[PDB]
């Protein structure tokens, strides 16, 4: 139950009972609609899909993504809706609720719900082994020429190859990751925000997936 889409606004803090400071990630979970209901009788699995942030309609000479194209008009026309930038399926929800076209508002969560927040990472670029992985660097003095290299990559001639999973350098990367068992502390209905306790992955104005905890 209880999935929603938003985007990271930033990070603040809130005081609670007996003055306890608790860190807070403001998520603007605005203008989410139920956009297609999926059934096991048609697809094999039960889910809805929620479109998050509406963008401008079809324009003939459109050269960028903020004007929808003709497949995204007709897809968001089968629901009485505007075309959305982000579209995600939620299959933990109950499919027998959520009529197609429902504005799934921000007051589906109450202060104190446990949730999972899914987002991409920041993305750091090409990084080395002691930054991409938590590797111990070599000594910076005493004659050494090994500082920030990876170490040995194998054994000599039994295993005359490098095994995969070696943890070599490359792209640190914005990949999807969930932080689990976060709390909702404050739902502002008029501002359409959620204050989730802690930090969620991604940069600012990113995209989150707040759904309830499977644990």
């Amino acid at each position: 139950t209880k999935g929603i889409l938003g985007r990271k606004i930033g990070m603040t803090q809130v005081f609670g009972e007996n003055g306890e400071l608790i860190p807070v990630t403001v998520v603007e979970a605005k203008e989410n609609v139920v956009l297609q209901k999926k059934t096991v009788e048609v697809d094999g699995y039960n889910a809805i899909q929620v479109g998050f942030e509406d963008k401008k309609a079809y324009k003939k000479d459109a050269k960028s993504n903020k004007y929808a194209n003709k497949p995204a008009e007709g897809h968001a026309k089968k629901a009485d809706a505007a075309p959305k930038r982000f579209i995600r399926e939620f299959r933990n929800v109950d499919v027998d609720a959520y009529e197609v076209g429902q504005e799934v508002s921000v007051d589906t969560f109450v202060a104190g719900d446990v949730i999972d927040v899914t987002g991409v990472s920041k993305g750091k670029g090409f990084q080395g082994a002691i930054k991409r992985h938590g590797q111990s660097r070599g000594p910076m003095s005493h004659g050494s020429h090994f500082h920030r290299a990876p170490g040995s990559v194998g054994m000599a001639s039994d295993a005359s190859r490098v095994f995969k999973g070696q943890k070599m350098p490359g792209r640190m990367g914005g990949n999807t990751v969930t932080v689990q068992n976060l709390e909702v502390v404050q739902v502002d209905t008029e501002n359409k925000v959620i204050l989730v306790k802690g930090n969620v992955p991604g940069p600012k104005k990113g995209l989150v997936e707040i759904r309830t905890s499977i644990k």
């Binding site: 803090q13 005081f15 007996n18 003055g19 306890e20 400071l21």
Partner: protein
């Protein structure tokens, strides 16, 4: 942050003036300590007389780190030196004349005797 081989002032009349840490007891691999953490330590500068003497290996609790502790209300506390009280392996001290301010965060570590023998606790 108090690790192995940090010199700490000794904050009572247990017989020691300076002490250096051997290990931070607790778990395995435990690197640092703050207020309320018991450390095992050898005294380096000792008062002539008293109880402990130079080269004894004593257990002792951290009071008032220089990199102090954070509280639940988002409050902080920091001190100008690292100090230390030699204890007597039941969370009770050796001396009766504990010097200097003690952080509040060792009331909940059952060091109530160290609090009562101290000046104003903050």
């Amino acid at each position: 942050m108090i690790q192995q081989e940090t010199r700490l002032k000794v904050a009572d009349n247990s017989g020691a003036r300076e002490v250096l840490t051997i290990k931070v007891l607790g778990g395995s691999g435990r690197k640092t300590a703050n207020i309320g953490d018991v450390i095992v330590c050898t005294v380096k500068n000792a008062t002539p007389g008293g109880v402990v003497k130079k080269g004894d290996v004593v257990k002792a609790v951290i009071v008032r780190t220089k990199s102090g502790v954070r509280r639940n209300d988002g409050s902080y506390i920091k001190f100008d030196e690292n100090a230390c009280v030699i204890i007597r392996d039941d969370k009770g001290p050796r001396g009766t004349r504990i010097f200097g301010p003690v952080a509040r965060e060792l009331r909940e570590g059952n060091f109530m005797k160290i609090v009562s023998l101290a000046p104003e606790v903050l």
